[PDB]
Design a protein around this ligand. Structure first.
Ligand SMILES: CC1(CN2CCC3(CC2)CN(c2ncnnc2Oc2ccc(F)cc2CN2C(=O)C[C@H]4C[C@H]42)C3)CC1
Ligand SMILES: [K+]
Length: 459
């Protein structure tokens, strides 16, 4: 059952109503993860899953239809939300018979979630992150399973069970000092029931060498807020869900609950880039706050803080700063071993190397044709440092990184820098691969076939 202080806040008729419910919950020692996730999932379902109103091309009279379209909000009645809340609690409270939780108990709660899920659905669909999705559709995405287990543990009074988050995987931590770990969901087959010890030991990006986020209840709220998915379709985001996420992230920010959450700070900066809130820090300040957070709390072993920053510089045509931030990105990855479950960060580096940097340099070339970053040997050195970090990442790893297609874009990006610029650098490389082709990189003529042979040499 819901406390009367919670019920008095319903019905929710606006974004602001939702923000007040979140503000009220975050003022308590145990913000109700199940209540809050159900509200967000309900609002998201009727704003993005079933879009009620779609998202026109002057005259003396008023226009027949709203000339700028409509935004809307689906009213969240207490009756609807409490009914779903009671459904979840009856389910969880019934399936387990009851300040440190044991491994046997955590596995039990995890199994309750796991075995409730549909046997066959597309695990990568949008809008199956929330407990609304779990209750009304018996479907959860990978990290949504972990969040639901944490939520179920809170509903059972297991105050020591918490969400653990890397940059692409989720599990639970528990025990005396939060040092116990259990896999509860799949990634990518599954390691459910295992500890994460072997993943931390293999130095894969997926477990961040142990420098992963151990949430408290307030960061679990921040997680579900980051989990809002505004996509209506591939080309259309719900303005309302973006605005809801933005107001909620600022609320969490002001309470200090994004201090140890770098990707949440980058998320907020991305939103401020599109819709700046007057009186708030500008996006660059927030991007640098996320980098400072990763340095302070996670040993500077996170990748995305620098990709957030680089992307902003890229969209703002700050070529020098973008290239330096990508070089900084590769400098963090170079100390990891590329493992089989690391595909997500691989795809991000792939798009940077083979699309975003080529586009950035083509943009810069269009300015020069009409000082330019393409005439700056520091920019060229940053490009080489980016590839050096990727090569060192690959070096000695169980999985190859570079393939022939990467060499095509490298040759093209090298060519964007005139030989007279390239011949000015004096660089030392970490990777054997880059050491083995330093002279090819600074030669007046760029030997495409040799660079392809060298970049594709087997690790
Ligand atoms: C490349 C760039 C953009 N890019 C950066 C990376 C994200 C996508 C956008 C930001 N984001 C996250 N934000 C906050 N919390 N977790 C996140 O990721 C995880 C982490 C562990 C998991 F197990 C599952 C997910 C997926 N996930 C989310 O996306 C939100 C909540 C539901 C969780 C991943 C420029 C930087
Ligand atoms: K390596």
């Amino acid at each position: 059952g819901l406390k009367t202080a919670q019920k008095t806040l319903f019905p929710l008729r606006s974004i602001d109503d939702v923000v007040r419910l979140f503000a009220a919950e975050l003022g308590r020692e145990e913000p109700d993860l199940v209540l809050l996730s159900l509200v967000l999932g309900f609002v998201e379902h009727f704003l993005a899953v079933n879009r009620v109103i779609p998202t026109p091309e002057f005259q003396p009279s008023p226009a027949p239809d709203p000339p700028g379209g409509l935004t809307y909000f689906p009213v969240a009645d207490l009756s609807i939300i409490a009914a779903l809340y009671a459904r979840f609690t009856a389910q969880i409270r019934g399936a387990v018979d009851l300040g440190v939780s044991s491994r046997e108990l955590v596995k039990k709660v995890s199994d309750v979630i796991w075995n409730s899920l549909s046997r066959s659905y597309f695990k990568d669909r949008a809008h199956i992150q929330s407990l609304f999705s779990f209750i009304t559709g018996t479907k959860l995405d990978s990290s949504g399973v972990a969040f639901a287990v944490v939520g179920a543990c809170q509903a059972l009074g297991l105050r020591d069970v918490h969400l653990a988050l890397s940059e692409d995987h989720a599990w639970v931590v528990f025990g005396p000092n939060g040092e116990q770990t259990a896999e509860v969901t799949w990634h990518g087959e599954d390691r459910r029931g295992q500890t994460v010890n072997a993943g931390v030991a293999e130095r894969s990006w997926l477990y961040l060498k142990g420098s992963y986020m151990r949430c408290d209840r307030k960061m679990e709220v921040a997680f579900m807020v980051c989990a809002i998915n505004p996509s209506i379709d591939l080309h259309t985001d719900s303005l309302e869900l973006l605005q809801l996420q933005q107001k909620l992230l600022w609320l969490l920010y002001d309470l200090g609950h994004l201090e140890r959450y770098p990707m949440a700070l980058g998320n907020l900066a991305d939103l401020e880039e599109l819709e700046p809130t007057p009186g708030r820090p500008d996006p660059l300040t927030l991007y640098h706050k996320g980098i400072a957070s990763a340095k302070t709390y996670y040993r500077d072993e996170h990748i995305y803080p620098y990709m957030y920053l680089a992307g902003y510089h890229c969209r703002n045509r700050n070529v020098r700063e973008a290239l330096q931030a990508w070089a900084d990105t590769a400098t963090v990855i170079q100390d990891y071993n590329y493992c089989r479950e690391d595909e997500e960060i691989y795809k991000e580096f792939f798009e940077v190397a083979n699309d975003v940097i080529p586009n950035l340099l083509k943009e810069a070339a269009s300015l020069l044709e009409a000082g330019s970053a393409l005439q700056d040997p520091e920019c060229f050195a940053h490009l080489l440092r980016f590839y050096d970090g990727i090569c060192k990442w690959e070096e000695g790893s169980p999985t190859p990184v570079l393939h022939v297609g990467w060499a095509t874009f490298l040759v093209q990006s090298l060519g964007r820098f005139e030989g007279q610029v390239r011949q000015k650098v004096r660089i030392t490389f970490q990777s054997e691969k880059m050491k083995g082709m330093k002279e090819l990189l600074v030669a007046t003529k760029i030997n495409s076939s040799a660079i392809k042979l060298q970049l594709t040499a087997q690790s």
